Amino acid sequence: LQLQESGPGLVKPSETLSLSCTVSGVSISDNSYYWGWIRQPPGKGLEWIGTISYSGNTYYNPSLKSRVSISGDTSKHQLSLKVSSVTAADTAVYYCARQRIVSGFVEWLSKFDYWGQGTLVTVSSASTKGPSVFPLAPSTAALGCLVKDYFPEPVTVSWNSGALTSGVHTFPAVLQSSGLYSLSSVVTVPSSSLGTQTYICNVNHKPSNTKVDKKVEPK
Amino acid sequence: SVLTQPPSVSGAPGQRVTISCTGSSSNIGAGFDVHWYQQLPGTAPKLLIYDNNNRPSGVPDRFSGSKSGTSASLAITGLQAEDEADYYCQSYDTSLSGPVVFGGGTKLTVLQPKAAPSVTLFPPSSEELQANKATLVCLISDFYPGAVTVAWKADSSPIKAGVETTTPSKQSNNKYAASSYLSLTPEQWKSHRSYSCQVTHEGSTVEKTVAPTEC
């Protein structure tokens, strides 16, 4: 029962956006199930994009019908969403979801029972940029990483390959005057462990395929 | 946006709260079922209520749905702090607007007490300084409500220049977080005795400070 959104985190204006969703544990052409795409602009609400049945048929939202195209690959168990001729207003988080239906005169679109986790796609004429990661030394003890000058979001930050959870607090990125982002992540740790345990952050930036690990040290 | 929802709804814990969703003749009035979703900050929507008033396993009895006329509403009894989220209504549509329609979205704000910010200020990294750049990282989180003032002062003299400050954003605990960056050249960092980032929340100001101390 899993849905995994996939695709680039950036597209330029007047360019076709392409996203994909890998479905797991259920067949993408199984009867009684429909699959669809939904989008959410930063700080805004949900907008349905379109839905595809268990057969070939697709239905779309008349507000984006001209540009939107959806396809299901029955052998790969995955969806495809195309959005041609993008603009600034297409910047959004795209979601993959499974849609139930009600069988009457027409199979009626219904409740979305399972949702994936979306992909933030930014529309911009700028190109991607990986972050310049710098360590923030500790001083009971607060230490962290500074992920500087990158584009566009998201950035994921793990500590000790996910082993360190307790005390982790990552902050919201700031959009700098330059057009690039800056993001910090810190961990509150026992000061007694500063010289005994290794503390390394794991900065991922999917738009530029960048992964930066950085050991943070005192002094 | 086609279905209309309250922009914002509040309530204290242990209270019963209601979130409305009223459309046209097409979306609800036509007789089509209403579905509700829950969205926690920074996460994907969860199926909360389906087919007007049914609960999927995993949803508390505290939640219930209702439909009458062109409206539908969501009822929460025994309101928890956990419930603070964004709520969305769904209905099939027969209008020019496409088959699936969502409502405007509702900011459900469960009561929180005043919370003073936790501020941590970091001096520019030595690695960063080697790059001929220098930024100070002021980090204030876990606070409520989402409103703070950031002041930067070289020694005792404040200077509003080179400042990149964020907008508060709530965390999983529904308390806000905000970060401020000060962009200097390494020589400015060195020139002054000490730099201070001070944040003013609830009439109480926290003034952390840093200075050019190599080690």
Short mmCIF file of C-alpha atoms in Angstrom, two decimals, chain A residues 38 40 44-48 60-62 95 99 108-113 115-117 133-137 142-144 146 148-149 169-177 182-184 186 214 219, chain B residues 32 35 37 39 43-47 50-51 88 90 92 96-100 102-104 120 122-123 125 127-128 131 133 135 137 139-142 164-167 169 171 177-179 181 215:
data_model
loop_
_atom_site.label_atom_id
_atom_site.label_comp_id
_atom_site.label_asym_id
_atom_site.label_seq_id
_atom_site.Cartn_x
_atom_site.Cartn_y
_atom_site.Cartn_z
CA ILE A 38 -3.48 16.66 -6.84
CA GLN A 40 -0.77 22.26 -3.52
CA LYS A 44 -2.33 27.39 -0.49
CA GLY A 45 -4.91 24.61 -0.63
CA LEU A 46 -5.58 21.53 -2.73
CA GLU A 47 -6.32 21.56 -6.47
CA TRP A 48 -7.23 18.37 -8.32
CA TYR A 60 -9.14 16.22 -15.75
CA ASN A 61 -9.86 19.53 -14.11
CA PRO A 62 -11.16 22.00 -16.74
CA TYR A 95 0.66 14.43 -4.93
CA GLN A 99 -9.05 7.24 -5.67
CA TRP A 108 -18.42 8.04 -9.63
CA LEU A 109 -15.17 9.61 -8.44
CA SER A 110 -14.78 9.21 -4.63
CA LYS A 111 -12.68 9.36 -1.50
CA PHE A 112 -8.91 9.33 -1.81
CA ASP A 113 -7.95 6.65 0.68
CA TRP A 115 -1.91 9.45 -0.48
CA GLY A 116 1.76 9.59 -1.35
CA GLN A 117 4.19 12.28 -0.20
CA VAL A 133 27.61 23.29 3.72
CA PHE A 134 29.53 24.67 6.74
CA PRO A 135 29.78 23.29 10.35
CA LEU A 136 28.46 25.14 13.43
CA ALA A 137 30.59 24.31 16.52
CA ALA A 142 24.08 23.24 20.60
CA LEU A 143 25.69 22.22 17.32
CA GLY A 144 24.59 22.12 13.71
CA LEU A 146 24.54 25.59 7.81
CA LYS A 148 23.99 27.84 2.36
CA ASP A 149 23.08 29.20 -1.08
CA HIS A 169 15.48 20.56 14.98
CA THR A 170 15.78 21.73 11.38
CA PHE A 171 14.68 25.28 10.46
CA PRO A 172 12.68 26.73 7.57
CA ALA A 173 14.84 27.98 4.70
CA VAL A 174 15.13 31.65 3.98
CA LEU A 175 14.93 33.01 0.49
CA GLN A 176 17.89 35.30 0.06
CA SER A 177 17.93 38.50 -2.04
CA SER A 182 19.79 29.19 3.15
CA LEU A 183 18.83 26.53 5.69
CA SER A 184 20.09 25.56 9.19
CA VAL A 186 20.78 21.88 14.78
CA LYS A 214 29.82 16.99 7.40
CA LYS A 219 36.81 24.42 18.84
CA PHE B 32 -23.06 13.95 -3.90
CA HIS B 35 -15.15 13.72 2.01
CA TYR B 37 -9.03 15.42 4.78
CA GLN B 39 -3.31 17.89 6.81
CA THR B 43 2.75 16.59 5.50
CA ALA B 44 0.47 14.95 2.93
CA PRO B 45 -3.35 14.90 3.49
CA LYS B 46 -5.01 12.06 5.40
CA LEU B 47 -8.44 10.63 4.63
CA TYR B 50 -15.53 9.69 3.83
CA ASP B 51 -19.06 9.27 2.31
CA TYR B 88 -10.25 20.16 3.44
CA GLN B 90 -14.31 17.04 -1.07
CA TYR B 92 -18.22 15.31 -6.84
CA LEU B 96 -18.14 23.21 -15.68
CA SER B 97 -15.60 23.03 -12.88
CA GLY B 98 -14.23 19.46 -13.00
CA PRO B 99 -15.72 16.34 -11.40
CA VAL B 100 -13.53 16.56 -8.29
CA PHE B 102 -12.00 20.82 -3.07
CA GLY B 103 -12.85 23.50 -0.60
CA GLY B 104 -10.79 26.55 0.27
CA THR B 120 20.73 30.09 19.69
CA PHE B 122 26.21 30.91 16.05
CA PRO B 123 29.33 32.81 14.94
CA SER B 125 32.08 28.99 10.67
CA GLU B 127 35.54 26.97 7.10
CA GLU B 128 33.10 29.59 5.80
CA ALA B 131 35.77 31.41 1.66
CA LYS B 133 32.25 35.16 3.52
CA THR B 135 27.28 34.80 8.27
CA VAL B 137 23.03 32.31 12.40
CA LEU B 139 17.81 30.63 15.50
CA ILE B 140 14.62 31.02 17.51
CA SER B 141 12.05 28.24 17.64
CA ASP B 142 9.40 26.70 19.96
CA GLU B 164 17.85 38.00 5.84
CA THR B 165 15.03 37.04 8.25
CA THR B 166 12.38 34.29 7.80
CA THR B 167 8.65 34.20 8.54
CA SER B 169 6.46 28.51 10.70
CA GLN B 171 6.68 22.74 13.94
CA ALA B 177 10.17 28.69 14.47
CA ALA B 178 12.15 31.51 12.76
CA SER B 179 15.72 32.00 11.57
CA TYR B 181 20.96 35.52 8.96
CA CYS B 215 40.05 27.86 19.07
#
